[PDB]
Amino acid sequence: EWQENKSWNAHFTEHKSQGVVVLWNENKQQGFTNNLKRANQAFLPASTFKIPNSLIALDLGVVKDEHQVFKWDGQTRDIATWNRDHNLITAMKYSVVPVYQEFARQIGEARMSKMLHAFDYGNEDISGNVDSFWLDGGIRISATEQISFLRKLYHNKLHVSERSQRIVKQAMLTEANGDYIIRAKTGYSTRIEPKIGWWVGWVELDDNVWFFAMNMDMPTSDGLGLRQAITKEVLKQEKIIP
Amino acid sequence: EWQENKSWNAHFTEHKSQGVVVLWNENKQQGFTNNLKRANQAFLPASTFKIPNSLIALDLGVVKDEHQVFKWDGQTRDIATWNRDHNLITAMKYSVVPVYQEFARQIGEARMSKMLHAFDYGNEDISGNVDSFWLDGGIRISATEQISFLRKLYHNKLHVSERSQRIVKQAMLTEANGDYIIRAKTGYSTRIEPKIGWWVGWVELDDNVWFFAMNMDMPTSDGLGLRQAITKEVLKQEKIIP
Ligand SMILES: *C(=O)[C@@H]([C@@H]1NC(C(=O)O)=C(S[C@@H]2CN[C@H](CNS(N)(=O)=O)C2)[C@@H]1C)[C@@H](C)O
Ligand SMILES: C[C@@H](O)[C@@H](C=O)[C@@H]1NC(C(=O)O)=C(S[C@@H]2CN[C@H](CNS(N)(=O)=O)C2)[C@@H]1C
Ligand SMILES: C[C@@H](O)[C@H]1C(=O)N2C(C(=O)O)=C(S[C@@H]3CN[C@H](CNS(N)(=O)=O)C3)[C@H](C)[C@H]12
Ligand SMILES: C[C@@H](O)[C@H]1C(=O)N2C(C(=O)O)=C(S[C@@H]3CN[C@H](CNS(N)(=O)=O)C3)[C@H](C)[C@H]12
Ligand SMILES: [Ca+2]
Ligand SMILES: [Ca+2]
């Protein structure tokens, strides 16, 4: 079903961290985690919500394609990379929240709810402000539920156009070399306790796909680099990446 | 305009090589090369023809998607890479000429010809064997012509479905990190003199795209790695990648 390999807890232990890593072997239809309980604990998605938000925007024509330019609104915000024009690729890369809050308002409460239900996304609850519910509203998703959603996206099985799903998977591209391709999205939920960081996505190999979703306790912005580092220690331990 | 930059030749001579690198700044609509004459010299495309071949195969339904398996059909025909199953992703990556021979036979010469004329691909000539003309037939393409073709592909402007162009560009993924994305294709022309190696594609930045096409004399297979090496040194020299 889902095997618990607690030897992964060493990688959180060394870095003085608490969290969960979940892997899914698509060929073998087998899942692995260091913590079955935390694997199914549901949290705010934070910026991991940029994946379904992007899909819905594209499917509804709110975003025409990955080249459409979203003008900086002229408000100088805290993250310098947000203070400029963006397309879908760079808004995903730099996790540009204002662009996605605009997407959400144009999508609207009713279409957003209907799509999240169509997606079976987390708890399907978008209570709160239409442009912030994934930050401080009622939506919740677990690491295992992220995998479930991502597997559909990978197979083009979500109830949106194939084109939307291909564009979003292009925009998720994070790293690629001769050994693997990673498509993924980070998140950091701070507006409601507990403060946690996310990394969800998958690793594409020649012959298989390994889906992953991790989250960890993140009191300060210090440990944000550990989201990718710990996941990759796990991947390396299992010899998924060289 | 086309600017000549002879200073790039230092990267060929230090490797006891001769060749041409062509770069195109999409934003500026400006091209750069070390050798204007060789930049326009037309050669057999060899494995770089996998780009138009895959596009046509997908557009015509010869290949259903990037997951369809092409089974090994017994033959252990010397090359080990061709001793296993493939899909479009892996067949682009590795030398598996029987798979692309099968595409071309199914496409057939009438539609192959029509498509290469619609692509304005090289000298638009498919004379020779329908299952090998890109290796030993009459088709020829120059580095500048590779750029013209790739630019259309990047803009989804070729006269095939948008979906087929998106899939081939996925299959072209070679390298990606926080600084750049490279989509590209190698080639090695040996069946007709002169023996040459190819590397064609583009570099996606946050705010621009740099297309490239290089070829270089390749008297033996031991210099194949110099295709990527020399191209990347020219990109680094120009500060396109760090
Ligand atoms: C297509 O041009 C040709 C393929 N393509 C290539 C190529 O390198 O572009 C080759 S090279 C052959 C297979 N891999 C060996 C080299 N390994 S490496 N890591 O690149 O040094 C030798 C092959 C000839 C088809 C049409 O034959
Ligand atoms: C709620 C939203 O504000 C939040 C929700 O995800 C946003 N999404 C993400 C994310 O994690 O993708 C970030 S990260 C941000 C960029 N610069 C700092 C990081 N420096 S480092 N090098 O990592 O220490 C913090 C935002 C805070
Ligand atoms: C070199 C290419 O061929 C790669 C590819 O593709 N490979 C697969 C795969 O197919 O998954 C793996 S993963 C690795 C093998 N098995 C271990 C755990 N398996 S297990 N019992 O935990 O499920 C991890 C390799 C990277 C190999
Ligand atoms: C930091 C990111 O935003 C990157 C991006 O995007 N950038 C562009 C671009 O926009 O091309 C470049 S390239 C570099 C600047 N100019 C030189 C050649 N100029 S020139 N006149 O010879 O063509 C090479 C940077 C990598 C920067
Ligand atoms: Ca449901
Ligand atoms: Ca050099």
Ligand SMILES: [Ca+2]
């Ligand atoms: Ca033949």
Ligand SMILES: [Cl-]
């Ligand atoms: Cl967001």
Ligand SMILES: [Cl-]
């Ligand atoms: Cl499903």
Ligand SMILES: [Cl-]
């Ligand atoms: Cl070929």
Ligand SMILES: [Cl-]
């Ligand atoms: Cl991609």
